Design a protein around this ligand. Sequence first.
Ligand SMILES: Nc1ncnc2c1ncn2[C@@H]1O[C@@H]2COP(=O)(O)O[C@H]2[C@H]1O
Length: 201
Amino acid sequence: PTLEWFLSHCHIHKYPSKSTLIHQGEKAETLYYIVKGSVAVLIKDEEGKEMILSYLNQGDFIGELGLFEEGQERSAWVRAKTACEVAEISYKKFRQLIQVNPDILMRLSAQMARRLQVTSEKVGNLAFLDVTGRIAQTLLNLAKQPDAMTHPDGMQIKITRQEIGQIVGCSRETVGRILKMLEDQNLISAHGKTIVVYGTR
DNA sequence: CGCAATAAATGTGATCTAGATCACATTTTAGGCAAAAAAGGCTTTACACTTTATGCTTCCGGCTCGTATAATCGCACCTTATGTGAGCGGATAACAAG
Ligand SMILES: Nc1ncnc2c1ncn2[C@@H]1O[C@@H]2COP(=O)(O)O[C@H]2[C@H]1O
């Protein structure tokens, strides 16, 4: 449909792992779209602690905020998590496609609504719910993600002990303590990054 | 399955604050309602405006009249001296025709 009409003017260019698709400081002159794989977006402070806002899997767009208002810069950093195939379309030639077919814009701004609902309703849980409650909800949220692999016992995901604290809002030390505590009670499992939870499904 | 190497992620655990509890007595808070002090309200009376008829007076202003008067006339002295050519009508001399 409209999606196929979008790939007719794209520029196929594969990006290796640990690459740089979006550099905070450069000029936004290329729209990116995810075909296969996944990518992560995060920011940094003055020390070195990271902070992931939201994850973007396949079928999502990369850097679309610098399209509505011409003359902007890259907000956050976008590092390629895994081998992903991303297209390339200049914003200049994109604006001409909207004036002749606004329907194409109805697709991009359609995914910008869900990314706001999962963030606004998350703040409330990061002010009342304790560590046990915040992490508990996170386990189910990551299980609903398409990048999650089906497990005979439950769900198998791969996330570090830092990214967890960046979602529930806490220190990295606290995460490791509770994580190992649930292991003794036979509730979940962890072997570095891969965390297999139980009770799901 | 092990190997590569730049980035991100890992543990440590004693020290020292950061953030939270509770039930009851003290201290602050909010808008509430008249009173006082102020805004314009919309009265009714105190006075003050230039204006304009007038005519009477003195002072400054603006205009003429007639009168009185001599004249209807006479040297010697001081310092300069426009520029041209072009265009035009008129007066004069030389010429051919009758
Ligand atoms: N919380 C978020 N949810 C979804 N996408 C994001 C989030 N934060 C940053 N991004 C994307 O990261 C991109 C960084 O570059 P852009 O400003 O071009 O566009 C930004 C967004 O598209």
